[PDB]
Subunit: 331 residues, 4 copies
């Protein structure tokens, strides 16, 4: 004689298992900006939230659930134990220490490497066949770290990489040309940091190479100082951090972007961190951003950008900076 | 080396298996309406189209394929064959004859049962676990036929029903009260045809019962003629058929709504066709629309709506009307 | 010639005037939640952000601007100034103090009225025709203050109200019955706070009245404790504040829903804060939530819900509770 | 004592005027594929349908309205008199005679020029400040025709042009490279017909010019026959027409694309028909496809593609073919 029973006549029961589950590790600025972005884009039927902060974790779960009416993701769960993570198609990693004002992402390696040695084994135990998306900084170094501990194939370990760096670039080009960013094509390759390489030789609007029209564009001295557009891409993190304390909206938006190409299997090209041994005459185990076709299996192919010698030389420079760190860890 | 081999460095092969595959059976006015509507709502990662008319088929496929840039469903395929439908989560059957001007949907029964006798075993064999969504008319009777041939549990054999008739009802109510269809609540149960029941005991705007404010509302011969709204619902198909020859945009929207609740496992309540033996004093195996909770497994529950004696009377005469045609068992 | 002049041939200048401009006043947790949610629903063609904290402001703007590639709102601007808010169709005011742990929203009244005294005339002067959406707490009392200072007709001064509390109610009901919030109907009217009224006379699933099946439902001391659901609604804010310190994702969703009905002129019914003098025996100028029909002009109509004697009693004590604080007229 | 009056307490009245109205002239295959696409993308708050076929017109209006529940465009209107069109932001023209099997779009000029002399004056009378989007064939010639009769500025008269041709191209490239079309950049310029020019010199994936890697790509004799990809772009219309009778889905999708860049003012680059006198050393009044930045004022800028002499020569050839027709009309 329960209200339920007078109302509803049961046929079936509580199957459980999700088809499109996504986990978000870390429910801080970035982790909830990832979460909100991915929920608004309707990519998951089940989202799992994990953090060591219990109170914060349950509190943000409840604020997302209160919003159920307006969403199309009917199961929102969270916990400290990784069992909640079970059978995730994708695991977004956002946990760890963040940059203080004027702090290099490279300073974070000791503290975040200790976080990863802890969580990687726990997430691979419950989801042996997930696509790992690393966001935590220094993201190129942590993506290697996840690869190294997880034991996964190089395709299922992705670092968010220069997806963000190239969106700010497009945005800055777009404002000089008076064209929407979607329409200015420009690649920011290498490290998601101070050593990123702009590929000047490939920047274009509607198939036209801005460097054939303006040979002075890029890695020099004279101009309309296009070079400073790469430099604001490099200082953009520092400046936003100095102004609000941290960055969150643009990375959350750039993670939903990748997460749509993985979940829908579109095979779109994105500058993301992947293993590059055997490609630019880089003979080591470096992870840095290259254009990669991203799908349901992760990184299925890498695009061999034609790079000039100025360009190819700042990419080797970015890749050495980076293995100078990586070699000292080996956990 | 191909231009392909120069441009792209391959890291994997693998088994391209669909996660959210939708099959549309019959590429006519209703099929393509369903198809476009499902593609614009980005519910599938692969859509498969089957039809007997080989040319029509290829043509609709190519037209949809050339709009690929504007969609997020990477794989669009067809065949006469059914090998192309494998591992579908849902299959929408729109194949068959439709009404000529002034023709009852019950009159198509004989021709459509003949095609269901061949299509169901070809479907049931290649997607053992799909949800069958029956749109072909008379929808109630083909849903029962589909069930019967398939061997599937009832949870997984859904007729499109009064989802559409309720939408039309809400629209019309909407007009009169000066509020969007979304804020006008009300259900059309029973046959998706001339015998459908308006449930005036339940029509409301914000929780207030219109039958409580105006006791003469509807199945009353008295003053503002709310009853003429139900006659417009009944008549609406006949009327669009006399003006454009067929109906398509409303039912393609109506099917993608449904499709949405199933793929995302929403657990929303839809007036759809299901087996109502046991409920509302119905002793025969007939299919008709009753409010059902829809999810990744099909109908998991039926809501027991509390009908007035006159509304129950009218539902029973609706099941009595379908059973009369249903003793023909030509399969 | 610039690279710009070589690449692009200009055909026009013109007056870039916004058609769907939205202003968010206050770039705190609630403001940015509202902002991202409105940007992902692509409701505006230009969004303007105003705050007194100059750095925070620039920072949030730049973060949102760097995600431009992933949005469809081409112009994102800010200023401390209010010249930036010109010709807005809607303005969302989220500026002010929020609750500390265990603090009543009524306690912020004094501090928020002091800021409304400066912000309203700066808003009212540059968008003579905008719709004002008040989110700042106590929302009911600031909506009345906003009205009073502005000189605007009541149609165009909206408090966010119980839209949120109804969402939370539907969520909780949802859980218990095993259906999505969207198919559970029910309203929280009165104060957006401790005095809110559950309208149990109207809670339904598919037109059936839960109070009809279970007469003991709610404002009854009897058996399954549906009344504890209302206490969780009342308590939910306090509880997320004790766990994460503030609430933000639910109200940003809740505001974009509202925003949607206004920009598209949907004529949907939302429980929002409006002037209820005349209705339900209310003799004083108080603002509280009642079901309202929302459109391009603001509130065009109020639905007269038929309250049980105990529900009316409770609404009146809710207006009696707001009026007690409302005789303070410090403006 | 009407139901309405007991239910709703009126505050305001029936303002009317829309903010985002779109008209669709012609409710045939293309016109309703435009309509459905534009409604699903939620671009208008008001859609106006116009046709001389009265029955068909009212019938498709009703099928769209029946679908109101599932849409976010609350006013759907239609008529034979142009008064319904009043104060449209955008007017999509799809009316006219279509290609029979093996028929050139150039054969349609006599019959469609008579349609335009009739409707242009009627649409400019009611919407003096609309953006005209011509879809009817031969679209380059009709866009000139609308320009010439309307008296409008060259920015507010757009022909759908090679937006479709470039999407099929991207699609065909995408299938050879195994990359999503969104990621293969390739421009189809000139006439939306048999004389279209592929700009081989600008085709790329992630900033890399396929012609520097494969100099043989394009307008020759030897290869992997990339040249046949342009040729299937040219025969694609004929083949779909031969298979289903006409084309509709891809153009409807490509019209919603342009219509979003106009309505949201994104300033995106699109290959569309515009006046090109004074640009490729073309000294006459030709309308053909060029990359143009499209916004709320229409075509605000044209992008000066760097073209090779093979390329620049097929573009002059396309532009002469076209003015050989145009010069014989002069109405
Ligand atoms: N890759 C990119 O572009 C990008 C961009 C911006 C931010 N960042 C990075 O994102 C990371 C997070 O920044 P943020 O603002 O959200 O930080 P935050 O302080 O707001 O949140 C970090 C979260 O990590 C959690 N955490 C710590 N140990 C954990 C463990 N074992 N398991 C789960 N969670 C744990 C915390 O409790 C905290 O809630 C930083 O490393 C940062 O530099 C990356
Ligand atoms: N349930 C609803 O509300 C409702 C709404 C509208 C229409 N319908 C029904 O939709 C069905 C289809 O309507 P329609 O306008 O698209 O008809 P249509 O003639 O446009 O298309 C029907 C198609 O079915 C295909 N078909 C026939 N037999 C087949 C077989 N064995 N295998 C594969 N394909 C086969 C045809 O070849 C044709 O392409 C009709 O039965 C109609 O009455 C139902
Ligand atoms: N109505 C609802 O349901 C509800 C929901 C949640 C929160 N709120 C209310 O939202 C309001 C904002 O909450 P919050 O978390 O974002 O606070 P917050 O402190 O995060 O941000 C408040 C912001 O207001 C700005 N501000 C203060 N005075 C201003 C002025 N004169 N001009 C411009 N900006 C000014 C601040 O500088 C700060 O950026 C609080 O009053 C809170 O109680 C309402
Ligand atoms: N530009 C492109 O890529 C493109 C692509 C494909 C189709 N086409 C064109 O679109 C046009 C329409 O093709 P379709 O399949 O929809 O044709 P259709 O036969 O289905 O419909 C044409 C509509 O034009 C209407 N019409 C005729 N005179 C009219 C008048 N004064 N006012 C309003 N409507 C009038 C008709 O009544 C008919 O409903 C053709 O010219 C065709 O070649 C353009």
């Amino acid at each position: 004689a329960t209200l339920k029973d007078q109302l509803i006549h049961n046929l079936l029961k509580e199957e459980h298992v999700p088809h499109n589950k996504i986990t978000v590790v870390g429910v801080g600025a970035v982790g909830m900006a990832c979460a909100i972005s991915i929920l608004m884009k309707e990519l998951a039927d089940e989202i799992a939230l994990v953090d060591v902060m219990e109170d914060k974790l349950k509190g943000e779960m409840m604020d997302l659930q209160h919003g159920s009416l307006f969403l199309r993701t009917p199961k929102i769960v969270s916990g400290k134990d990784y069992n909640v993570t079970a059978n995730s198609r994708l695991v977004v990693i956002t946990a760890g220490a963040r940059q203080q004002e004027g702090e290099s992402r490279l300073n974070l390696v000791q503290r975040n490497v200790n976080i990863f040695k802890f969580i990687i084994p726990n997430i691979v135990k419950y989801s042996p066949n997930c696509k790992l998306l690393v966001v935590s900084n220094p993201v190129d170094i942590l993506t290697y770290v996840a690869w190294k501990i997880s034991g996964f194939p190089k395709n299922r370990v992705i670092g968010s990489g220069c997806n963000l760096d190239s969106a700010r670039f497009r945005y800055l080009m777009g404002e000089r040309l008076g064209v929407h960013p979607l329409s200015c094509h420009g690649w920011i390759l290498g490290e998601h940091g101070d050593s990123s390489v702009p590929v000047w030789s490939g920047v274009n609007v509607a198939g036209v190479s801005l460097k054939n029209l303006h040979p002075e564009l890029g890695t020099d001295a004279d101009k309309e100082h296009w070079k400073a557009v790469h430099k604001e891409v490099v200082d953009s993190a520092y400046e936003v951090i100095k102004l609000k304390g941290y960055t969150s909206w643009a990375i959350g938006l750039s993670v939903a972007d990748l997460a749509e190409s993985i979940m829908k299997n579109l095979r779109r090209v994105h500058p993301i961190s992947t293993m590059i041994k055997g490609l630019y005459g880089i003979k080591e185990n470096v992870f840095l951003s290259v254009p990669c076709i991203l799908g349901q299996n992760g990184i299925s192919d890498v695009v061999k950008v034609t790079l000039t010698p100025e360009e190819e030389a700042h990419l080797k420079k970015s890749a050495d900076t980076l293995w100078g760190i990586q070699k000292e860890l080996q956990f």
